[PDB]
Amino acid sequence: VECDFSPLLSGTPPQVYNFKRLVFTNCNYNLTKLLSLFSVNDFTCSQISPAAIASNCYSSLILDYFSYPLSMKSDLSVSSAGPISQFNYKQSFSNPTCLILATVPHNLTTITKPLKYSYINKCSRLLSDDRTEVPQLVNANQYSPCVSIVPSTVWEDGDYYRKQLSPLEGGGWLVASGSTVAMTEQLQMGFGITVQYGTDTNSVCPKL
Amino acid sequence: VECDFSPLLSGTPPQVYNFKRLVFTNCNYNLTKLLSLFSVNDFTCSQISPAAIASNCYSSLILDYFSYPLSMKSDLSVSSAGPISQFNYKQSFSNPTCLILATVPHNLTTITKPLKYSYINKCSRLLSDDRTEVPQLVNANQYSPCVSIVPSTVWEDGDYYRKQLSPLEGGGWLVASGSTVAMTEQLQMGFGITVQYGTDTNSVCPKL
Amino acid sequence: SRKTYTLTDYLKNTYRLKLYSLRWISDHEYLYKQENNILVFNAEYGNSSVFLENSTFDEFGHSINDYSISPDGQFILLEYNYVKQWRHSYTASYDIYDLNKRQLITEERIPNNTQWVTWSPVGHKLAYVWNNDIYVKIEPNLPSYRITWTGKEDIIYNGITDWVYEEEVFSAYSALWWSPNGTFLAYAQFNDTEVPLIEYSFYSDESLQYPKTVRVPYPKAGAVNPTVKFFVVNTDSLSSVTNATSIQITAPASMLIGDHYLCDVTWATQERISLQWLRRIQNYSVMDICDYDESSGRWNCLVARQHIEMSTTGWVGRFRPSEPHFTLDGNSFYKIISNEEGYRHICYFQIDKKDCTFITKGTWEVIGIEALTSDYLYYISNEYKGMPGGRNLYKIQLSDYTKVTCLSCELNPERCQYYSVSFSKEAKYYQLRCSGPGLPLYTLHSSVNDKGLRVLEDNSALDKMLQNVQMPSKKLDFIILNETKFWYQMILPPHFDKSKKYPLLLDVYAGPCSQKADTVFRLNWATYLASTENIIVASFDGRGSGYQGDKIMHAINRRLGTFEVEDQIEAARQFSKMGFVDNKRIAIWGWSYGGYVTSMVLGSGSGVFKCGIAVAPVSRWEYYDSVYTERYMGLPTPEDNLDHYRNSTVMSRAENFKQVEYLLIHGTADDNVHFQQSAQISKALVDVGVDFQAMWYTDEDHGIASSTAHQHIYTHMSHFIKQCFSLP
Amino acid sequence: SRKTYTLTDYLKNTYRLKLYSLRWISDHEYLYKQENNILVFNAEYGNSSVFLENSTFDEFGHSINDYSISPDGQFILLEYNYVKQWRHSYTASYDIYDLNKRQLITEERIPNNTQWVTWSPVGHKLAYVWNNDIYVKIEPNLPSYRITWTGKEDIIYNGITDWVYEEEVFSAYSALWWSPNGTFLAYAQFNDTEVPLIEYSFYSDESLQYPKTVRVPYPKAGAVNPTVKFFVVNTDSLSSVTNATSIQITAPASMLIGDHYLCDVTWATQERISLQWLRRIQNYSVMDICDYDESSGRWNCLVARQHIEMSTTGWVGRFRPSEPHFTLDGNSFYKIISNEEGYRHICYFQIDKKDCTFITKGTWEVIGIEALTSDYLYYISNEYKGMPGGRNLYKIQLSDYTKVTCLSCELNPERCQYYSVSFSKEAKYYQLRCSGPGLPLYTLHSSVNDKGLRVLEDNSALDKMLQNVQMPSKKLDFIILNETKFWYQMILPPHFDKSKKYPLLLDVYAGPCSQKADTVFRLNWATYLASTENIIVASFDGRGSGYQGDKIMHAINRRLGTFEVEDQIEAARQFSKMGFVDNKRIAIWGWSYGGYVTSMVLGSGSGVFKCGIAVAPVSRWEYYDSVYTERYMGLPTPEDNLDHYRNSTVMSRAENFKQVEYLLIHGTADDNVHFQQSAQISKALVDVGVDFQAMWYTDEDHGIASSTAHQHIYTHMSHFIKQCFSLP
């Protein structure tokens, strides 16, 4: 009973490509509670509405959170082919989803800011022919194949990473490039929610 | 009633040439109290004994304290013509005097150590003839005429200081040179006591 | 019994070549400076109106080093307080004068010590670099927008090149590229953090008590190279409320796996940009084509639009990959590419097709693509008469590749065989520049009919002057070495009698893709040597030389100091057995690479040469910069080409110098070919007991081209040459 | 028709001068090296015993650069892996070999890169400097005691000199002074924190890709000077339990008011030390006499024992104040002092009396005090025949100043007029060294009877060799300029006919207190020039020269570049009108100050000189170091002597060089007279259109004295001189 949003408030929200995932089965949620802590700048959903997503009961609720600048709102879209959907963070298209942009006030102090905002602007493989470049696109509910070579925070805008592949891994190379956006006065975050409606298992309901 | 040794325990004992003076009229003293805080390494008196100087009553007690290294014990003497008696600290020869060398333990923590021990190794005037050098000797119960140009702690062993004199001051120059001894594990201090026996005013007595 | 062309004549510039420099401001108008007045000439009529009186700034309070007029005539940029750095770099102050207000702009000025300034291609936007950061002015009198905050002296370069990119890649100090209508500003960022410093003394005026040590990040062969990143900023989305968003375009993955360079930046359309990247091993390069995304505001570089170019016999391009020339719709482009025979021709590309189509062929080469229209491609080449040292303007019909017209071959075929061209804004008109064999000739033409409008400068005054002086003659011809033509030129003394025997000076450069034999008319030191001192000055283009296909150009691949050295010797052999050459009076001299080859020849032990002069020579390849050296030599490692690096030093041959008289000259402030190189030569000669002549030039760079120094060095070389030749 | 002394002879050292170097180890014994064996010779008997077989270290594993035997014969210090720095400085490794154990000491060794090592004067204590800190070993195989912890490269120097103290004050790298029986070790500490760096390139081997920049704290005229502090440590009170107590002795108050130097350190007794300090304005100096206090353990310097020395016509001493020589009881001392006539004589001092008493007088000078006993003072002077370029040994009786005996004037008056002396430990014996006019002669003597024991080296083998070669002759004489003798020497070609007319080379130094005219026998370049090329090589000591009183020496005070320059010209005038000099063939050449004067003469416009060679010349005084320059010139400020600084540059006279042929030579690694100086000369000549000859020597210091470089420069100068003189 009562859904545990704890570890979100304590520490530093990771970068979009290292998004942390909170899973919710069998509990009650006050979400308008959670969204009353932050200052909320944008709320769009797919196959659901923000009104609806507070009200309904579900069999499964997934909350993904990360640091993310408001300046890059046009790239955090369900209908977007920017670097974010390509190489960083992709939601499922088969479940209803919501995307929240917020700003931690000052009043909230247990949430620490990192050096800067970072994201992956290139993730590709160079085949063993030394010619063919194949972008490695991120699949929903997964991390980029480049998170193994891209630091948790990018040191400088435009840095690039490489790693030669074993003949078993396919040969050729793995290659990535990181981008940065300057840290803001108040930290800015991104939230991605995904709901599953069950048959009989709708044990994730709001509370009253 | 009860003699106030307070400001000695709180802070950094100054350098021998900036010795701080505590005056005592009309009070009771527990001195074996004070000397039980420190570890005492040497106790010599002139025209009195250490036994006697605890017992007797006086009309006036003066306590002079400063930072001072045990390594330089041979220079802190009533029968010495080193730099200490010449340019730094001289007791009266007309009153009975005592000289105490001690070491603040660890147990004593309100007494802070300075960067190093410093003393004046030269204080002289150069006359307006640019040839004649006249050492400026320190008189009892006074500071060196060079304390105006020698920093409260000498920055480096052998540094030298100069100051041109106004025609009214005599012309020529004032000149000084500082020496240093490396700071010790436990701070080491120097105490100079001078007693005056009065006619009827012997209001500085011990206590029981 | 007329006078000669004297050394004094060359140094005082007594016999001047006139020019005609213009700036096309539209498709039919251009600016000219006449009696310090700036005029605008209409191309059609030839009528002119005054654009700027010379008097306008005769109350400025400064000397004016250079000026730049905004593309819309509204503003003029005034450059004063100029201080030189490298071949293309400097700092200065700038003022902006309003041409309508007829006033100076006094507020929000471009700061002093500004490193570079450029107008947008249309309008009057400004981009400038100050303290290694980029700034943009939309309106000239308003505050600037700071684009970058990472700039740092000798470390981070935003919008300007570092030393090696300036000298060996872009041939320019600037690393800014405006989109065609100035909406976007593309720029490079260089990182010299881990690049070793070359350090040297600068002495300056007498009054400077302690010399200054100059420190320049400079990668010698095999050293750590600078790093590069590329960005595009929208100059129309700028605001004083937020910091600018520079969108990065990353290099292709084939480059990111190792060391690489950015080698070309060319805009295709208003929203399409092409980039060429080059691997450190320079036989592999990729073009990236990037489109602006009007929704996201980013730049997408489709992998399918990549164009790989790679060499199997040497390096890519002559010095670097060629620049593409895009059709108006940016969906196809023309580019110079070496063909299956090794000759450089125009290839036609589709931005998403791998294979290209040659539109020119032959055993000659296209020198450059000069203009493109919907109907015609304009280019310069050496096809005419199979003379590789000739240049003519051609136009080829896009609908029919067999319809090629030569626009210059026929205008003045006796006087003019070396042409360059300047086109108006839609190639409606063009200015032609004849550089020889006769006196330079400048003419105006319309492209519509290829009708010749008029003569701009014919150099009649000089022709008039040169009739009263015994001028030398120039022979340009070839010899045949195992079934291959090799061109040479000879500057022949007046009243040349081929039965007599003349002393010969070999003028040599001989670097890869060099060309010292051409049809250019010149008034230089060799003119004086022939006119006054009766010396035959000869040059020879052997293996490694350019514009005659890769079989010749790639000959010296991974073996500099071999063939191009030998051929200079063999050329001297050939020359002597023509019968008018004193074989006891053959000298040789060269600057930079020419100085290297000169030295290598003097230490060959061939006994063909009696004396020689090396000016600022390379002495060993590991002392020279990475980009140039590794292009031809690879890396100086045992796994690669260390052997040929060590086999090709001048010092190695110190012993042989006992047979020759040697003059070694070098400037102390040479940041290009470091004084070091000569210091190592002289030291090896000392260590081996060889006497020689030396001369340093204090505070002179690679050019030794200050007024006094220039006269001094030529005078000194004159004495040395006359003395070796037992001349009066 | 014998052979000549050839250039080859000079460079290959075909005709060797033998020497006899010994080391007195007692009052009657000394060490000599004979066939690589070290022997001890008894002074009386002349019998010898072997001290060290040459074979001893023929299994060492290193080449042995130098050795030092402890004063008690028990230990030998072995110097290997030596690497040079300045004129007296270097680093190395050291091993210590036990002579009794006949073994190498393997534990607690002297570290590599040790900067200096010295034995105590008795016994076998060691003081060494490593990383700018002083260390002491009492027993060689036991751990060392660290004396100082403040050492820091280029900043804090403990026990070693910085650049300027090494070159211009102590003429040594060491700044350590053991008390006579090695109880105390006195030392200086120098602080170069705020002293500007001279920086220059070093190129090293070919294989070094990037040149190194050498940085040396070096005060040019008027710059911030190094600071100095003085300490004494008791080496007998050392212990591994506490850090050593260095007792400082402060300078006198007359020095502390401004910039000053430590200029002399001389022990008087086992517990008395004398110090001399010198003001930056070097016409004021003070001796301090300091006694050890056995109660406090400190050093007291009684103000009443101070001895002020000060000049009103120039600077104090020849180059620095003279060193005192104390009586055994240290209560009185002898010191060389200029008298009321300006001549340098021996004065007798009481340590607490201001006034001193002259014990010598005359219009000649004491060169140096060599030994002191209870009965006699021994000294070298030029009294003999009033020849200032002669040297003899004298002894004066302490009880009667009229009893002076010349110990050398009479031994071999024809062959020997230039003597130096080496005394045994109580002046019981002395070795005499004759340096000319004849072949050098080394003899042994006892002081008791002044009896000549024996001849050590007579150079008979060389005399034998030199009979088969046409050797030149040397004339030493004077001329009279307004009532003053001025000496010159001429190296005359063999078969000299004074009716013929010879070309003349002026060999010039001419710095303050220089002497180029003497009785020394030399085998150098001038020998070859005269023997083989029939050139008269002449030198001349004019105003500013030394050992003839202050009227001549102080003449150039605050005006270098004036009189001493003129007199060199006037000397050439005088020489030509003697009638055997070709006045169309007079050249001039000089190194360092000689290079300065040579240049100043070539730009005089006197037309007396046809050509000239400047090697590493000074060109302007503000480029040279503070200690030397300010001694003669003062400060380059308007309040002082800026005018004469600016009036006396070579560059100023660039124009006049059009009348002369000029050779300018300079080493790139000259830390003494910086390459800068020549760089400024050449630049001014270029800026004014004068041609000249130049030659740099890469990586050579002020000496240009590496084997190869030395041959190269002389060979090159030979050609230049022969060419100016139209010689075959």
Ligand SMILES: *[C@@H]1O[C@H](CO)[C@@H](O[C@@H]2O[C@H](CO)[C@@H](O)[C@H](O)[C@H]2NC(C)=O)[C@H](O)[C@H]1NC(C)=O
């Ligand atoms: C060149 O001359 C032509 C006319 O011969 C100029 O063009 C005309 O200028 C007149 C003013 O006299 C205008 O009223 C017309 O409308 C213009 N006609 C055109 C061609 O548009 C032109 O200004 C002159 N150009 C220069 C540079 O002086």
Ligand SMILES: *[C@@H]1O[C@H](CO)[C@@H](O[C@@H]2O[C@H](CO)[C@@H](O)[C@H](O)[C@H]2NC(C)=O)[C@H](O)[C@H]1NC(C)=O
């Ligand atoms: C220069 O080119 C740019 C890029 O195409 C033009 O900007 C576009 O203009 C259209 C029509 O106004 C707009 O719908 C687009 O949104 C614009 N794109 C951007 C990125 O601004 C611009 O019009 C041209 N500028 C000039 C001076 O003609």
Ligand SMILES: *[C@@H]1O[C@H](CO)[C@@H](O[C@@H]2O[C@H](CO)[C@@H](O)[C@H](O)[C@H]2NC(C)=O)[C@H](O)[C@H]1NC(C)=O
């Ligand atoms: C020089 O010879 C003398 C004797 O002629 C040596 O002195 C004596 O040496 C003998 C051994 O033969 C001793 O027994 C004597 O006691 C010594 N007498 C003296 C002078 O003290 C002396 O050792 C020899 N010196 C050298 C360096 O070989």
Ligand SMILES: *[C@@H]1O[C@H](CO)[C@@H](O[C@@H]2O[C@H](CO)[C@@H](O)[C@H](O)[C@H]2NC(C)=O)[C@H](O)[C@H]1NC(C)=O
């Ligand atoms: C070298 O000289 C020192 C200084 O005089 C001598 O040391 C003194 O010796 C006397 C007699 O033993 C002592 O009473 C003093 O206390 C000593 N002074 C100091 C500072 O040590 C020493 O004896 C001499 N050394 C040698 C090797 O003879």
Ligand SMILES: *[C@@H]1O[C@H](CO)[C@@H](O)[C@H](O)[C@H]1NC(C)=O
């Ligand atoms: C400016 O133009 C006028 C036009 O007559 C000309 O005479 C004058 O020489 C020019 N001034 C300069 C500085 O060239």
Ligand SMILES: *[C@@H]1O[C@H](CO)[C@@H](O)[C@H](O)[C@H]1NC(C)=O
């Ligand atoms: C440039 O420098 C000059 C000279 O110091 C100064 O007067 C002027 O204000 C500067 N200009 C700007 C734009 O700051």
Ligand SMILES: *[C@@H]1O[C@H](CO)[C@@H](O)[C@H](O)[C@H]1NC(C)=O
């Ligand atoms: C060492 O001494 C012997 C004595 O006969 C001598 O022959 C030999 O040449 C010497 N060895 C060296 C290295 O000088």
Ligand SMILES: *[C@@H]1O[C@H](CO)[C@@H](O)[C@H](O)[C@H]1NC(C)=O
């Ligand atoms: C000096 O250096 C050599 C060579 O590296 C080394 O073998 C030796 O141990 C060093 N000596 C000392 C005293 O450390």
